[PDB]
Amino acid sequence: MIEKVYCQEVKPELDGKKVRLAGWVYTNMRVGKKIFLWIRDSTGIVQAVVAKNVVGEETFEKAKKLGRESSVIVEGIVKADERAPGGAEVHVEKLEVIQAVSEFPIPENPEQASPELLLDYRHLHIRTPKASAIMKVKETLIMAAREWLLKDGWHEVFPPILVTGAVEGGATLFKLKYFDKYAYLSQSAQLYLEAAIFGLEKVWSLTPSFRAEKSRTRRHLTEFWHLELEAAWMDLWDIMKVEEELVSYMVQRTLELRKKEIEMFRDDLTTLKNTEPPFPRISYDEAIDILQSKGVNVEWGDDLGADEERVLTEEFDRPFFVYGYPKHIKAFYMKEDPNDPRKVLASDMLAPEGYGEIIGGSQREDDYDKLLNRILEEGMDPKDYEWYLDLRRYGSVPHSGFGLGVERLVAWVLKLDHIRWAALFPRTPARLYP
Amino acid sequence: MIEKVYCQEVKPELDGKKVRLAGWVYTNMRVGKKIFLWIRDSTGIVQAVVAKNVVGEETFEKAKKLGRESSVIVEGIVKADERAPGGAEVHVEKLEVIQAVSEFPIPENPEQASPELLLDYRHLHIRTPKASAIMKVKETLIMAAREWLLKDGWHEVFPPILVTGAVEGGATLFKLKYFDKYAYLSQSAQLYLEAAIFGLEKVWSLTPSFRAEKSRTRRHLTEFWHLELEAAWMDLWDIMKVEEELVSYMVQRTLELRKKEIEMFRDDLTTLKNTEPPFPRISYDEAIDILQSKGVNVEWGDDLGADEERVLTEEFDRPFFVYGYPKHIKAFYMKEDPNDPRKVLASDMLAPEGYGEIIGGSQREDDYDKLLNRILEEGMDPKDYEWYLDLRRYGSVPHSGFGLGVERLVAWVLKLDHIRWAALFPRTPARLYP
Ligand SMILES: NC(=O)C[C@H]([NH3+])C(=O)NS(=O)(=O)OC[C@H]1O[C@@H](n2cnc3c(N)ncnc32)[C@H](O)[C@@H]1O
Ligand SMILES: NC(=O)C[C@H]([NH3+])C(=O)NS(=O)(=O)OC[C@H]1O[C@@H](n2cnc3c(N)ncnc32)[C@H](O)[C@@H]1O
Ligand SMILES: [Mg+2]
Ligand SMILES: [Mg+2]
Ligand SMILES: [Mg+2]
Ligand SMILES: [Mg+2]
């Protein structure tokens, strides 16, 4: 390959050097007698100056016709100039038009289009600066997670997607024909991580999880990226510490690296700066009391939906935990609170600013009889979970874990109006394409 | 949590120190008047010495009954002793039996069981040393990939799994009901990576890919982990360099870190040591000539199946490329060789020692008309690929990419007899459970 110079590399210190840009036309404007093409690539935008008396009439005329997203190779000499973007521009010697474009269907400012148009053209939308910014933030949060997980001694595993068990209820299961059998798409890798702790003790996975959720909210996708941890020996309080340490490191690392991207989306970084341990912790009992005190008609035992969480966040300026939920609005696998068996040892981590739940986790039931009984009480067939029950027969240990919704976290970090914008190609009940 | 000391931490230099082990009984043997329990955890095995006159009769009797996989907490004093495993043992002061076990259904040496028993009990099999070793090698190869990808300036993206397009043919597609519509499980994220290069230039993803492959071979799963790269500006030769640099770094890094694990599986590390650029490259034409020279009844235009690849590997002592395949045994998206349009600019990377294909990649067709025509020739509906065709309308650039089968790579690195052992919970046409 003939090497390119990235836009971010075009700096005043390269004054007088030859560079080869490769990218796409961002804007095309005649300035005096010259054509100024701003060329975008993955790293920034550079001003390329095209002079008729330098490139000749043929190239000059071609340059006039280059609309947004025209693919081009540009060779020229860098000139330091305090007036140009980045304090340096390229004086064009040669212009190769790969493909001229005049009708790119995403507007120059995407937010002047209907969100439905942007989704119809999601494959084109993702190359635009804000959409690309979201993907850079996403990769950085995940890289940060992997740094923390490696340093803290967790093992990465690669759990199954095709499964036969519901982890998070039958209502959100996708079912498919699988040769002579039927399979489900995994809602969560948790049950498999629980098997894996017996060999590896501290495990984690990042997998797509699948939820056939009919409700079309701004916090639900039908497919999302799910970062999940499970650890032998740890109780609920232990796993909550892991959660706050991990989330804080993810947020602080992304603040350090992606400030520019975050500032495209936020006027106020306060809640992100505030994201360091210890996070505030309230019981579900306290949550009910707070909600009732603000006039919300909620009763002990009621589910905390998105609206309840939203009101609860008003009292917090960083992520916070709610723990000790009523047993019967919580998953079959969660351990009872031994001090109060009406509750389970579960906690959710809620993001502030109205965002609500980003992590759900718990200590797991480690007693065989108790777990079997919960399976039966929930109308589940123990046959489908015999392997999971085996984990309580062959050297059971106390253990706990959690799942973080990556898109949910990105949506809070960037104050997105909908979780769909944090997925590369979002999936919702009416959206499968592109 | 009360902190534990890991087995690998029990070293002669801790002589006289109190430690708390937490783990599972590996073996239980009476030695003289004492009970020797070898305790395994995620990091190794430690000899714990239980003396009746120290722990008392009740604890001593309990210790006699502890079979393999009994979950235990052991507190005691480290004693340096050249005779013990690791040169240090723990003299037990306190023994807490969490759960006693006497009938763990995986044999002490798993390979004395039918592979079908091991798969029936896959959830139990994975905690055993060799199976756990494979997972450590897998996480290390992947960590190595991420190190290389970050250093070389690639962006991580998180592409969709629910899709409407076949990338790699209709025959291996899983189809499912999706609300009022139908969806497919992604065979490969490639088409979406191609969309993503327009914003991010150099992209990669690690995703589960799904192949409804009826043939039950030792190189096919119905679900596998697929590491895929796509890059703007790069041609086939460029992407081949990326492939050899990445694979070499993965292998060399895993050799550096996981020598102990690899030596459980290999007598000979030669081919791994040999895995550094430049890898040997032969044309498909040369491959046919080699095969015919060894008496294989293959003709130019024929598909190279597993058996052909196996024979071809006899001539190589490290991974190697085969390039320039006949157009009509290759995918619809691949770019024709401009020098010879009977061929496409595709290459596979084959592992030696009979293993064969670990990567398939190509330069992509970047001409709209040519791609449309190939879609139509293959009996595909261009409507299902309109978005993919858009990538050839709105600033097309030359580009290339590839997919690496992680399990396929693990199977070669560890000389596994079947790819299934490199998946945490393998999926094959008759195996969906556990
Ligand atoms: N390993 C575990 O302990 C996780 C546990 N099995 C689990 O799946 N919990 S969860 O349903 O709360 O999902 C966990 C998180 O996953 C996110 N989530 C959960 N459902 C969705 C949907 N439908 N869309 C997007 N994101 C979703 C959200 O952040 C939740 O807090
Ligand atoms: N992004 C790309 O350019 C990849 C391209 N779309 C692709 O899917 N190619 S491939 O079919 O050869 O699959 C790529 C690799 O994926 C592996 N593979 C491909 N199929 C399987 C099955 N069924 N089981 C396990 N592993 C499999 C094998 O290592 C192949 O070399
Ligand atoms: Mg809830
Ligand atoms: Mg939840
Ligand atoms: Mg082939
Ligand atoms: Mg192939």
Swiss-Prot record, chains A, B:
It catalyses: tRNA(Asn) + L-asparagine + ATP = L-asparaginyl-tRNA(Asn) + AMP + diphosphate + H(+). Gene3D superfamilies: Bira Bifunctional Protein, Domain 2, Nucleic acid-binding proteins. The keyword ATP-binding applies. Its EC number is 6.1.1.22. Signal peptide: none annotated. Its main location: cytoplasm. GO terms for biological process: asparaginyl-tRNA aminoacylation. It is found in: Cytoplasm. GO terms for cellular component: cytoplasm. GO terms for molecular function: asparagine-tRNA ligase activity; ATP binding; nucleic acid binding. The keyword Aminoacyl-tRNA synthetase applies. Keywords: Aminoacyl-tRNA synthetase, ATP-binding, Cytoplasm, Ligase, Nucleotide-binding, Protein biosynthesis. It is an enzyme of class 6 (ligase). PANTHER family: ASPARAGINE--TRNA LIGASE, MITOCHONDRIAL-RELATED, ASPARTYL/LYSYL-TRNA SYNTHETASE. Belongs to the class-II aminoacyl-tRNA synthetase family. NCBIfam families: asnS (TIGR00457), PRK03932.1 (NF003037), PRK05159.1 (NF003483). This is Asparagine--tRNA ligase. It comes from Pyrococcus horikoshii (strain ATCC 700860 / DSM 12428 / JCM 9974 / NBRC 100139 / OT-3). The lineage of its organism: Archaea, Methanobacteriati, Methanobacteriota, Thermococci, Thermococcales.
